[PDB]
Design a protein around this ligand. Structure first.
Ligand SMILES: OC[C@H]1O[C@@H](O[C@@H]2[C@@H](O)[C@H](O)O[C@H](CO)[C@H]2O)[C@H](O)[C@@H](O)[C@@H]1O
Ligand SMILES: OC[C@H]1O[C@@H](O)[C@H](O)[C@@H](O)[C@@H]1O
Ligand SMILES: OC[C@H]1O[C@@H](O)[C@H](O)[C@@H](O)[C@@H]1O
Ligand SMILES: OC[C@H]1O[C@@H](O)[C@H](O)[C@@H](O)[C@@H]1O
Ligand SMILES: N[C@@H](CCCC[NH3+])C(=O)O
Lengths: 258, 248
């Protein structure tokens, strides 16, 4: 009674934009209600629906046909070859150095002001700058900070890789919130043992950059949320608000790895 | 013949020779750019009507055909982000005035070239309403992206300055309640600006109501709520000025 699979079919035809695909019931059987799992977290109902895949990947599309004696499901895989710049955050494209490949960012250790502290954005004294202390060139050479490197890549999603040599840098208020062994390096404050996960994601919304899985840009201040102050192919300048020291703001400047 | 075909970005247009005659062609895109090629791309960041001219060349000489094109909207992707904040968006306008109700909306200190520079108006910081009794707060600045980076300067006929400034200006100077000088100074009907990084430059010798002999300002803060500016005096060597504007 339930619809027979050999009479069910559909076409999935990329349109003007190869990442936007028309899904059309072409079944040799009428009197059907059809629903769709687009394989991208979206479900839909209708004879002809459109599916959008911002990211290059292989997806599975399921069509379910309903008639008076039940439902039957058929599938196709579809290969989306390339990322769609028109459906991806423009700042994510700068962080990854393009829609293809990856881009690694490191502390701007060769120039003054690559790391700094000042009154944070909720502090009555905020001025938007690290007005308490600004790190001179190579000022944090003698700790774990510059060992922390951040690669962005749009391989299936808004993906990040965090590499270090097993340690992050923080101060007394930071060290108390992490389980790893704390050491006092040459630059003072604390190195803490902290091994990143093998994979992260991120989101960009306006100026706000958020890292997944409680990640942070090598300096621990209890937050995974940053404000992008500057971002172009040469420079990533970030501000954050400390969650471990009420009213402290931190600034960080990254440049491309050579 | 030619076609002017808006692409995936409606502000970016493919100009293509479609002539039924196989020619060297050049183009005036009507945006200040000229080009040579069978197929060229034109960019119009600003909504407007533009005239495109194709010139075809043989041995006999040259013939020029034109079309008008209408670009409906401003293109956020090709306009300075700080310009959009000053104009309050891609449409309409936004007027900025002195933050007269808060301390520190006007001040003086050692300027950025001065060995004593500390980045603040450390010689004098104006208290709330401190310059009510002069022309300073009468000066209002509107930014609008209507064809370009456009500004309108409104006042009630006077700017505010000190002795060194008054000596550079042709208008009559008067001493108001706040002291220093009001100077007769009527703005032009229209100005332009440029923003490059943190450098804000005004056209046609304009200045932000207080005269210090410069049209160049450093942007210290710019968000939808605040414009905080520094400038370096061109009439008093080593003197810096600070100004804080908020929306009207
Ligand atoms: O905390 C308020 C005070 O901050 C002081 O600067 C400190 C920096 O020298 C140091 O490098 O970082 C700590 C925070 O991690 C800062 O507190 C300022 O010098 C004081 O002016 C300020 O009141
Ligand atoms: O590691 C960061 C710390 O570096 C010190 O040299 C500064 O005086 C302070 C700052 O908070
Ligand atoms: O115009 C410059 C002068 O401004 C005055 O308000 C300050 O008190 C002086 O310190 C400064 O020399
Ligand atoms: O108008 C500006 C001037 O205001 C005075 O009250 C200050 O003491 C000086 C400053 O240069
Ligand atoms: N200044 C606000 C209130 C308007 O205009």
């Amino acid at each position: 009674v339930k619809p027979q699979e050999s009479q069910l079919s559909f076409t999935a035809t990329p349109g003007s934009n190869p990442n936007v695909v028309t899904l059309k019931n072409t079944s040799s059987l009428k009197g059907l209600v059809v629903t769709w799992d687009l394989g991208n977290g979206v479900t839909a109902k209708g004879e002809e629906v459109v599916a959008s895949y911002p990211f290059a990947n292989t997806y599975t599309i399921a069509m379910t046909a309903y008639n008076t004696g039940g439902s039957t499901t058929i599938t196709q895989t579809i290969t989306i070859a390339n990322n769609d710049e028109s459906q991806i955050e423009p700042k994510a494209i700068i962080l990854a150095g393009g829609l293809t490949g990856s881009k690694t960012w490191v502390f701007d250790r060769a120039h003054d002001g690559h790391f700094g502290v000042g009154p944070g954005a909720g502090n009555p004294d905020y001025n938007g700058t690290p007005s308490w202390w600004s790190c001179p060139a190579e000022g944090k050479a003698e700790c774990a900070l510059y060992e922390n490197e951040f690669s962005f890549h749009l391989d299936g999603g808004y993906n990040m890789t965090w590499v270090n040599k097993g340690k992050i840098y923080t101060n007394g208020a930071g060290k108390d919130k992490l389980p790893g062994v704390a050491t006092v390096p040459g630059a003072g404050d604390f190195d803490v043992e902290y091994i990143p996960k093998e994979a992260y994601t991120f989101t960009v919304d306006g100026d706000k950059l958020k890292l997944s899985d409680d990640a942070f840009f090598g300096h621990f201040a209890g937050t995974s949320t940053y404000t992008i102050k500057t971002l172009n192919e040469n420079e990533l300048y970030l501000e954050c608000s400390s969650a471990v020291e009420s009213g402290n703001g931190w600034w960080y400047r990254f440049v491309p790895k050579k």
